[PDB]
């Protein structure tokens, strides 16, 4: 019911948001290839049941529904993707320091989401007066089996590969 912004938001938010989603959709598969190639066996072969889009607590998104509804769900996804990639980048730097291309393409993906976060959270605030949203975060991978740390990060980039195409398909 209450929302206020100091200064106005960026012009053409829906164009920026859709340009942000379409940019993430392009680099989605390249980050998928870069990941499992750095993990080695048995990931580039059993890429189906180890690196698939099966992620349990991943937030939902329905293509139907109003622009406010499609944007609050997108807010929870981008928050979920932010904590995971921050964890996965931490996990990978200990396991795989050799692949410095996977690190730089994980920092890129992380920063595009945070720029997309202001576009989504403001548009809720400036137009629908959302103010604040309660979100959920992913599981912490700080102390887990190395294979599970590798496998959890695999399934995330697989689900992210499939969910980002849905988001880029909608909106406009």
């Amino acid at each position: 019911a209450t929302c206020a912004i100091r200064h106005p938001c960026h012009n053409n938010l829906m164009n920026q948001i859709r340009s942000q989603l379409a940019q993430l959709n392009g680099s989605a598969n390249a980050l998928f290839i870069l990941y499992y190639t750095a993990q080695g066996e048995p990931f580039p072969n059993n890429l189906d049941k180890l690196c698939g889009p099966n992620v349990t607590d991943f937030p939902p998104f329905h293509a139907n529904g109003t622009e406010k509804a499609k944007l609050v769900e997108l807010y929870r996804i981008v928050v979920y993707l932010g904590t995971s990639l921050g964890n996965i980048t931490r996990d990978q730097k200990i396991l795989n320091p050799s692949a410095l291309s996977l690190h730089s393409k994980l920092n890129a993906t992380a920063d595009i989401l945070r720029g997309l976060l202001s576009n989504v959270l403001c548009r809720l605030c400036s137009k629908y007066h959302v103010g604040h949203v309660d979100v959920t975060y992913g599981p912490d991978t700080s102390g887990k089996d190395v294979f599970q740390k590798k496998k959890l990060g695999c399934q995330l980039l697989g689900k992210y590969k499939q969910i980002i195409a849905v988001l880029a398909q909608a909106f406009g």
Epitope: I5, H7, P8, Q16, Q20, I112, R114, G115
Partner: antibody, heavy 118, light 114 residues
């Protein structure tokens, strides 16, 4: 946390040249709109110009008082904001402020002094 | 071209007494989206400008509730219900609707009696 620190001020002869640098840390720089604002000794506040991100193709806008003579740059890889001022005049003697104007946050730097005299 | 005119200071406000500053614009600040992009800044001596009240009446975190915001269209008012020795400074008002360019007021210096 969030910090903005300018650097590049000093003494520059009239009709000269100068390049200021504002280094940021604490927020997402590749998405923030950055502005420059100056305050002449014993005067008010005057907006100088802004710059945007890569989505807007780093679009710049300038106040008519400095248009054609000041140039705003940004290096997203270093989180650094620039202001290349050529053809300086004695009116430009002011404290130049680095500021970030956004719905998320409003933050002003500490300012650096540019003095134009012979 | 937008101009921002402020009523200057009439006398040093005695400690604890209220104070009123007002900005008056040349054109309406109500935008098409429904928001009125009018801010209020404060510059303590030696310090850079900081934001007090944004979008007419909404306070900034870390600013005491003595400050109040009000106004509509072209007329606005800054309200301090009690004056303490930290409020001495210059107050500006900034618009962001018809932008660029962004414009400020000349500034209302506040003095205190004791």
């Amino acid at each position: 946390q969030v910090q903005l620190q300018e650097s590049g001020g000093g003494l520059v002869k009239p009709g000269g040249s100068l390049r200021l640098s504002c280094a940021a840390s604490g927020f997402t720089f590749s998405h923030a709109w950055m502005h420059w604002v100056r305050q002449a000794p014993g005067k008010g506040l005057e907006w100088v110009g802004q710059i945007k991100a890569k989505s807007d193709d780093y679009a710049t806008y300038y106040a008519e008082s400095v248009k054609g003579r000041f140039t705003i740059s940004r290096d997203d890889s270093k989180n650094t904001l620039y202001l290349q001022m050529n053809s300086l005049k004695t009116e430009d003697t002011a404290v130049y402020y680095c500021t970030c104007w956004e719905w998320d946050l409003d933050f002003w730097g500490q300012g650096t002094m540019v003095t134009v005299s012979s | 071209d937008i101009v921002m005119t402020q009523t200057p200071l009439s006398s040093p406000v005695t400690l604890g007494q209220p104070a009123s500053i007002s900005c008056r614009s040349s054109q309406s600040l109500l935008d098409s989206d429904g928001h009125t992009y009018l801010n209020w800044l404060q510059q303590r001596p030696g310090q850079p400008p900081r934001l007090l009240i944004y979008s007419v009446s909404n306070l900034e975190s870390g600013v005491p509730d003595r400050f109040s915001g009000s106004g509509a269209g072209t007329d606005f008012t800054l309200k301090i219900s009690r004056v303490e020795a930290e409020d001495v400074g210059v107050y500006y008002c900034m618009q962001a609707t018809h932008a660029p360019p962004y414009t400020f007021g000349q500034g209302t210096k506040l003095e205190i009696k004791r």
